[PDB]
């Protein structure tokens, strides 16, 4: 309870909760209110949003990212997953 803070990508479970809470804290909501299966283009990630939170995500992971991953995994249940394969 009272979750709100990043962790470290130690399995896809972690990358999920990170994405989720960083969605919560963008949107002013609970993390558990985030649709990890709905496309981010329907949430507040309008377009350039992707780059803010990408430039968090890649840095959180210690690396770079690519814009294609917006355009290929636009959901937590795909992004967190695929990050757990590109990285973890």
């Amino acid at each position: 309870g009272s979750h709100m803070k990043t962790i470290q990508p130690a399995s896809v479970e972690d990358i999920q909760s990170w994405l989720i809470d960083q969605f919560a804290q963008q949107l002013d909501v609970d993390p558990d209110d985030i649709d990890m299966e709905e496309s981010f283009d329907n949430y507040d990630l309008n377009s350039s949003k992707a780059l803010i939170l990408l430039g968090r995500l890649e840095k959180w992971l210690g690396k770079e990212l690519n814009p294609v991953l917006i355009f290929n995994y636009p959901t937590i249940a795909q992004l967190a997953k695929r990050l757990g394969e590109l990285y973890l």
Side-chain angles (χ1 to χ4, degrees), residues 35-51:
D35 289 281
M36 50 126 83
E37 289 263 271
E38 184 50 69
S39 172
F40 297 168
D41 264 350
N42 301 315
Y43 277 79
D44 177 54
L45 297 217
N46 184 65
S47 188
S48 33
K49 260 284 169 47
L51 290 295

Side-chain angles (χ1 to χ4, degrees), residues 59-79:
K59 266 70 266 281
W60 181 51
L61 275 152
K63 315 292 204 185
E64 60 174 31
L65 272 163
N66 206 33
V68 187
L69 296 181
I70 311 304
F71 317 146
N72 198 5
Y73 312 89
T75 67
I76 281 111
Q78 292 168 242
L79 186 60

Side-chain angles (χ1 to χ4, degrees), residues 26-39:
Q26 269 290 345
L27 281 155
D28 207 4
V29 299
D30 247 307
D32 230 46
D33 199 24
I34 306 306
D35 289 281
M36 50 126 83
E37 289 263 271
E38 184 50 69
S39 172

